[PDB]
Design a protein around this ligand. Structure first.
Ligand SMILES: CCCCC/C=C/C/C=C/C/C=C\C/C=C\CCCC(=O)O[C@H](COC(=O)CCCCCCCCCCCCCCCCC)COP(=O)(O)O[C@@H]1[C@H](O)[C@H](O)[C@@H](OP(=O)(O)O)[C@H](OP(=O)(O)O)[C@H]1O
Ligand SMILES: CCCCC/C=C/C/C=C/C/C=C\C/C=C\CCCC(=O)O[C@H](COC(=O)CCCCCCCCCCCCCCCCC)COP(=O)(O)O[C@@H]1[C@H](O)[C@H](O)[C@@H](OP(=O)(O)O)[C@H](OP(=O)(O)O)[C@H]1O
Ligand SMILES: CCCCC/C=C/C/C=C/C/C=C\C/C=C\CCCC(=O)O[C@H](COC(=O)CCCCCCCCCCCCCCCCC)COP(=O)(O)O[C@@H]1[C@H](O)[C@H](O)[C@@H](OP(=O)(O)O)[C@H](OP(=O)(O)O)[C@H]1O
Ligand SMILES: CCCCCCCCCCO[C@@H]1O[C@H](CO)[C@@H](O[C@H]2O[C@H](CO)[C@@H](O)[C@H](O)[C@H]2O)[C@H](O)[C@H]1O
Ligand SMILES: CCCCCCCCCCO[C@@H]1O[C@H](CO)[C@@H](O[C@H]2O[C@H](CO)[C@@H](O)[C@H](O)[C@H]2O)[C@H](O)[C@H]1O
Ligand SMILES: CCCCCCCCCCO[C@@H]1O[C@H](CO)[C@@H](O[C@H]2O[C@H](CO)[C@@H](O)[C@H](O)[C@H]2O)[C@H](O)[C@H]1O
Ligand SMILES: CCCCCCCCCCO[C@@H]1O[C@H](CO)[C@@H](O[C@H]2O[C@H](CO)[C@@H](O)[C@H](O)[C@H]2O)[C@H](O)[C@H]1O
Ligand SMILES: CCCCCCCCCCO[C@@H]1O[C@H](CO)[C@@H](O[C@H]2O[C@H](CO)[C@@H](O)[C@H](O)[C@H]2O)[C@H](O)[C@H]1O
Ligand SMILES: CCCCCCCCCCO[C@@H]1O[C@H](CO)[C@@H](O[C@H]2O[C@H](CO)[C@@H](O)[C@H](O)[C@H]2O)[C@H](O)[C@H]1O
Ligand SMILES: CCCCCCCCCCO[C@@H]1O[C@H](CO)[C@@H](O[C@H]2O[C@H](CO)[C@@H](O)[C@H](O)[C@H]2O)[C@H](O)[C@H]1O
Ligand SMILES: CCCCCCCCCCO[C@@H]1O[C@H](CO)[C@@H](O[C@H]2O[C@H](CO)[C@@H](O)[C@H](O)[C@H]2O)[C@H](O)[C@H]1O
Ligand SMILES: CCCCCCCCCCO[C@@H]1O[C@H](CO)[C@@H](O[C@H]2O[C@H](CO)[C@@H](O)[C@H](O)[C@H]2O)[C@H](O)[C@H]1O
Ligand SMILES: CCCCCCCCCCO[C@@H]1O[C@H](CO)[C@@H](O[C@H]2O[C@H](CO)[C@@H](O)[C@H](O)[C@H]2O)[C@H](O)[C@H]1O
Ligand SMILES: CCCCCCCCCCO[C@@H]1O[C@H](CO)[C@@H](O[C@H]2O[C@H](CO)[C@@H](O)[C@H](O)[C@H]2O)[C@H](O)[C@H]1O
Ligand SMILES: CCCCCCCCCCO[C@@H]1O[C@H](CO)[C@@H](O[C@H]2O[C@H](CO)[C@@H](O)[C@H](O)[C@H]2O)[C@H](O)[C@H]1O
Ligand SMILES: [Mg+2]
Ligand SMILES: [Mg+2]
Ligand SMILES: [Mg+2]
Lengths: 234, 234, 234
């Protein structure tokens, strides 16, 4: 009965209310990333330049939406009108950098938890890509390429914003073969985006959409979990 | 009677017609900055690539307006439609880089003068922030955050444009602890912006607006004059 | 009879249907450039990251249009709606990086051919600038400056996009006096742009427009051919 069960699981995941737990997971991981990139002085830095620190995290937390607006010519500022989102994001940021005894940070970096957060984040990423594709389809019905790129921007735009932040923080530097970091994330966002676009135009995808959705989420979680448990071979 | 006098001084400064003297002060200082950043070959460089040099100065001279348009999704080109402004800016730029015997440059870098120009510039910056907040309020009445960010963009956006220019000129490089430059400008623009935003929504500011205005300008001039007379302790 | 013949040649060149041969020439040269900038591992790189490689070439192939939209506040994505163009561009890109035995690449880099392609590209660049000016004139009838800048953006915007790509690829680095590369391209686009703008407002240009057009194209081809045959003195 798998294929009837799987179909239900897919519709299940696809209907999950992301706010506020799946969103918070993404914010937490995003803040941890900004904190890791800030260095050993991260805490001193955050206490001396809170506005800058807060900004660095908000930009990364909503990177996909900023890039998306940029591509579509919508006010870059748009995302900041999701008051609930910005508030939740600022609270997480406050907790990650300033919780007493740094408990939040310590709890979030404990492997079992970081792993649970990563799963929730992948679920949320899949939703961002799908939403991005749907939004693009409503604006440019016949532009398959735009639809795909927008979907990818919503799912992997953090890379662009990171560069922007490292330039503004004066730390950007070439990345010419320092280490071998095998990341399939953005390539996976491309595939997911194409798949959702095709699905939206009912073409090569004859499979039940709720099942395809399950597979996309499944692959995201897989590749993500693989890189977390491993280091160089999956 | 101070508080009646002060109130008048505040309304006074707030009504000052910025064009063309307060504007020219800002243009002069902006051009001097681009010239200092260009190096020893600045003059040879400017004589070989005048269009590029002119562009570098216009971008910096109107940085706040370009960033503002960028954030609001308005044509980035908008600022260039202020013919009088662009003309005055181009004239100042021409004089700073090409005046015979370099008199303009020499006069502008003479401490007493550079100090007078700095005062006028701070007065103009305060007006940019306030105007930015008002503009944002008219477009997004309930978005306090957007209003603040726009105000800050109008007051401290030159930092973004500078990076853009150093990338286009091929000179950008990390700024990892070369020297200890204590600049409170942008942090002050943040405060000023918040204050004007609050003031616009008549909340925590029970003080006479014209008096608050005086304080903001006063603090800008102070922090600015402090950094000019000092080097590492104020 | 030259001046009657020349006038005809000018109207001639100006009416040339750019698609698909003049366009393909530009795409081919653009792809060769991205390939040269990718290095010795270019081929391995392209086979491991095709989506990224394809993107790098599309961004450069339509750089002028992306910058133009950016300046005018039009959706940055707009250019991708020229399906025929994007298809032709993707096909050229596919052929340049993956043709069997690399014949396309080998044929395109054979001096006589690269020289022929360069001529066609210069013809196309002239058309981009003129189109850019006309577009700007229709939107902002009295903004001479905007009209000129837009024209220049359409003709020399690839420089901006290149920087963007080197940042995203993690290879950007200062260009502080490594070699002496004498490029007059963008300075020539500035002149061409001013000339077309003036021409559009029927001012200082009393010369037959079709003749001026011929001269502009002629100068582009000249400066371009000069740099190709030479290395340091023309
Ligand atoms: C006028 C210009 C005109 C030019 C604009 C072109 C317009 C046309 C359409 C292009 C459509 C964009 C598709 C979105 C692509 C995209 O997602 O960006 C790519 C590369 O981007 C480019 O090649 C660069 C693509 C251009 C983006 C626009 C930026 C221009 C704005 C200014 C900033 C300039 C600074 C750069 C980033 O992909 P990546 O491999 O570099 O970075 C990944 C990626 O972001 C992953 O999502 C992320 O994982 P998560 O954090 O788990 O999400 C990885 O981080 P981790 O270390 O945490 O694993 C990153 O490491
Ligand atoms: C698609 C991307 C999507 C991402 C866009 C995010 C949209 C969301 C909203 C963010 C609201 C922006 C608030 C404006 C912030 C702002 O003002 O920028 C900050 C840092 O900016 C960032 O962290 C960076 C903030 C991002 C700005 C956008 C740039 C993206 C465009 C392309 C350029 C990429 C290259 C960078 C600059 O602050 P700073 O401390 O770095 O620089 C100061 C500041 O500019 C002062 O005003 C200036 O003093 P004055 O000349 O007297 O005015 C100092 O120069 P001095 O040496 O002469 O004393 C500078 O040194
Ligand atoms: C918010 C910011 C707000 C600030 C925005 C300012 C708005 C106001 C109006 C400015 C009007 C723009 C006019 C277009 C100028 C322009 O064309 O760009 C200039 C420099 O640009 C700047 O100084 C930089 C001009 C700013 C461009 C905007 C970029 C901001 C976006 C994000 C990216 C940030 C990364 C940069 C590039 O000129 P270039 O000499 O650096 O590069 C040349 C040029 O591109 C030639 O066309 C090209 O030849 P071809 O391939 O045959 O076409 C050469 O390549 P080759 O090695 O193959 O010979 C290049 O080497
Ligand atoms: C409720 C809304 C509150 C948020 C409002 C908007 C927040 C303001 C964002 C800009 O913050 C700036 O960030 C810079 C860093 O990019 C700091 O540069 C300072 O700190 C840097 C390092 O972080 C140094 O490199 C610089 O030299 C030094 O000037 C600067 O002080 C700070 O003001
Ligand atoms: C100097 C920077 C400091 C910024 C301070 C400004 C904060 C302004 C908050 C005013 O509106 C808030 O809206 C929140 C929602 O966004 C509410 O949260 C409550 O309501 C939300 C739903 O509206 C739920 O999500 C929350 O979990 C629940 O705590 C909260 O009660 C309410 O006061
Ligand atoms: C990175 C480290 C992680 C940071 C740590 C912060 C985690 C916060 C855990 C919140 O746990 C929630 O607590 C709610 C109470 O606030 C519960 O509400 C539920 O139970 C309440 C009673 O306890 C009822 O009043 C509510 O209506 C019912 O929704 C809800 O089930 C539970 O998930
Ligand atoms: C530290 C890492 C480990 C953390 C793992 C815990 C994650 C907690 C996030 C909770 O997410 C919620 O899950 C609910 C279910 O429990 C969903 O109920 C929803 O979905 C159900 C079906 O799955 C329906 O039956 C319900 O009616 C409907 O409210 C709801 O949308 C979703 O926000
Ligand atoms: C009335 C309106 C008039 C203004 C119209 C628009 C002005 C044109 C802006 C672009 O100017 C370009 O600036 C580049 C610099 O960013 C120069 O690069 C040249 O100079 C650089 C150094 O400044 C070098 O690094 C480069 O290699 C070299 O090609 C290039 O020659 C020049 O054309
Ligand atoms: C190759 C680059 C060279 C660019 C040359 C193109 C210049 C075009 C100027 C034509 O319009 C100008 O407008 C100026 C105003 O912007 C006037 O200045 C006069 O009028 C202004 C007010 O309109 C005052 O601000 C000035 O101080 C006063 O000199 C000036 O008379 C007038 O000719
Ligand atoms: C960085 C180095 C600084 C660069 C040096 C350039 C400074 C230019 C100084 C201008 O001084 C102005 O001269 C005006 C004359 O052009 C005067 O007009 C005034 O006086 C004129 C008579 O002199 C009358 O005709 C006018 O109506 C009356 O407005 C005005 O008061 C005075 O401020
Ligand atoms: C080298 C550095 C040292 C330079 C210092 C000199 C600065 C000169 C800038 C002149 O600024 C003007 O000041 C006028 C006053 O003199 C103002 O008159 C205006 O404001 C007055 C009140 O202050 C009113 O009484 C007037 O009617 C009204 O025209 C006018 O707006 C303003 O542009
Ligand atoms: C029909 C439409 C198809 C096109 C859809 C959109 C194409 C997707 C564009 C982004 O492609 C990304 O480019 C990155 C490069 O900028 C790659 O980074 C990888 O490769 C880089 C080198 O090229 C390394 O520096 C990075 O560390 C490494 O993660 C990444 O894998 C790849 O996904
Ligand atoms: C995974 C990435 C792979 C992408 C595959 C998607 C391609 C979709 C193609 C469908 O429409 C195409 O339009 C082309 C035009 O753009 C046509 O070319 C033909 O028609 C054109 C004019 O429409 C001419 O320019 C061409 O030379 C001629 O081959 C072609 O027949 C037709 O099928
Ligand atoms: C960088 C290396 C370069 C890459 C190599 C790819 C170059 C492709 C060459 C195409 O040559 C074209 O072939 C067409 C045929 O497909 C001809 O059509 C013409 O001749 C055909 C018969 O051969 C007729 O059917 C057509 O109607 C008539 O338009 C056309 O004249 C000719 O220019
Ligand atoms: C490897 C480098 C060397 C490659 C050099 C070969 C370049 C081939 C590109 C062909 O460009 C076409 O030339 C046609 C002429 O042959 C033009 O016919 C057009 O223009 C003619 C006038 O020039 C008119 O008579 C025609 O009716 C009209 O169709 C047409 O627009 C244009 O696309
Ligand atoms: Mg949704
Ligand atoms: Mg005003
Ligand atoms: Mg045309």
């Amino acid at each position: 009965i798998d294929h009837d069960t799987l179909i239900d699981a897919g519709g299940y995941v696809q209907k999950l209310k992301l706010y506020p737990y799946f969103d918070a997971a993404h914010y937490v991981l995003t803040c941890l990333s900004v904190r890791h990139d800030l260095g050993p002085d991260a805490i001193s830095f955050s206490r001396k330049h809170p506005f800058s620190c807060w900004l660095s995290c908000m930009l990364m937390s909503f990177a996909g939406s900023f890039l998306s607006c940029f591509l579509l010519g919508e006010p870059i500022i748009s995302p900041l009108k999701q008051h609930a989102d910005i508030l939740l994001g600022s609270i997480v940021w406050y907790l990650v950098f300033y919780s007493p005894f740094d408990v939040v940070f310590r709890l979030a970096t404990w492997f079992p938890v970081k792993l649970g957060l990563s799963v929730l984040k992948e679920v949320q990423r899949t939703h961002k890509i799908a939403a991005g594709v749907k939004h693009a389809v409503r604006i440019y019905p016949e532009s398959y390429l735009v639809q795909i790129l927008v979907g990818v921007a919503k799912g992997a735009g953090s890379g662009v914003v990171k560069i922007v932040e490292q330039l503004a923080r004066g730390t950007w530097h070439p990345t010419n073969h320092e280490i071998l970091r095998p990341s399939f994330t953005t390539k996976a966002c491309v595939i997911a985006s194409i798949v959702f676009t095709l699905e939206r135009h009912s073409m090569y995808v004859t499979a039940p959409h709720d099942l395809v959705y399950l597979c996309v989420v499944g692959f995201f979680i897989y590749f993500k979990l693989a890189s977390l448990c491993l280091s160089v071979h999956d």
